[PDB]
């Protein structure tokens, strides 16, 4: 079943043990933890990259794994449509303190066509792809995160 605006699955807070677990600290560009992050170059994912830095591609191995599975299910669901990432790992700083975006453990996503009528189902597909927490965060995107 599709999620609706403001709904999350599992229906518990993101940082709970059963969901994505605790924040571990912001990962900055000059840091040692930054080396755990490698760019996702999957040709079936669109990365917004408004930053012109490639930051949105950077994410943990687990985040990659679930994101790549979702890329397949999106194309299966709606032929001609692809998964789009608006935010991956972030250094711009507009996310809340303790945001999993600062650790490469969260992505904001849309469909390639920006058809908001598809977002509830996109959220369901992210749950089925194995994201540890999926949140219809905004009318404009779905937020998906993973455990450390």
């Amino acid at each position: 079943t599709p999620l609706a605006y403001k709904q999350f699955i599992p229906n518990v807070a993101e940082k709970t043990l059963g969901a994505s677990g605790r924040y571990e600290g912001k990962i900055t560009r000059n840091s040692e933890r930054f080396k755990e992050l490698t760019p996702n170059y999957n040709p079936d994912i669109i990365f917004k990259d408004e930053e012109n830095t490639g930051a949105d591609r950077l994410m943990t191995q687990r985040c990659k794994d679930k994101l790549n599975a979702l890329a397949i299910s999106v194309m299966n669901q709606w032929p001609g449509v692809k998964l789009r990432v608006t935010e991956g790992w972030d250094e711009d700083g507009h996310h809340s303190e303790e945001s999993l975006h600062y650790e490469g453990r969260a992505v904001d996503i849309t469909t390639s066509d920006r058809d908001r009528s598809k977002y509830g189902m996109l959220a369901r597909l992210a749950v089925e792809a194995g994201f540890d927490w999926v949140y219809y965060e905004s009318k404009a995107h779905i937020h998906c995160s993973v455990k450390a």
Binding site: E50, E51, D92, G93, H94, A140
Partner: protein, 99 residues
């Protein structure tokens, strides 16, 4: 200028307006006179770097209110400082939704 501003925060103040506040340190460009800042904003649904609209603000300001935006719409926001010689690097790019 060869150092651009840094956007500290963006926050929606209404369904049509977003406040942004930046830092810019004059000595980062040897105290070269800066004539002002350019503030760029485009709907987040666009990935077309040509779709940024621009506001021009004076050099003394460290904040700006962008107006005439669309209700409940996300915007990509970035900025430059400028002078007679030309323009800086772009800042960090924030994403911010109107109410």
């Amino acid at each position: 200028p060869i150092t651009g501003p840094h956007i500290a925060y963006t926050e929606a103040v209404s369904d049509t307006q977003i406040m942004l506040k930046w830092t810019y340190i004059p000595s980062s460009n040897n105290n070269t006179p800066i004539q002002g800042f350019y503030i760029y904003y485009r709907p987040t649904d666009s990935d077309n770097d040509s779709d940024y609209k621009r506001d021009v603000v004076e050099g003394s300001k460290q904040w700006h209110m962008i107006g005439h935006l669309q209700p409940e719409t996300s915007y990509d926001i970035k900025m430059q400082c400028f002078n007679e010689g030309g323009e800086s690097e772009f800042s960090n790019v924030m994403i911010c939704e109107t109410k």
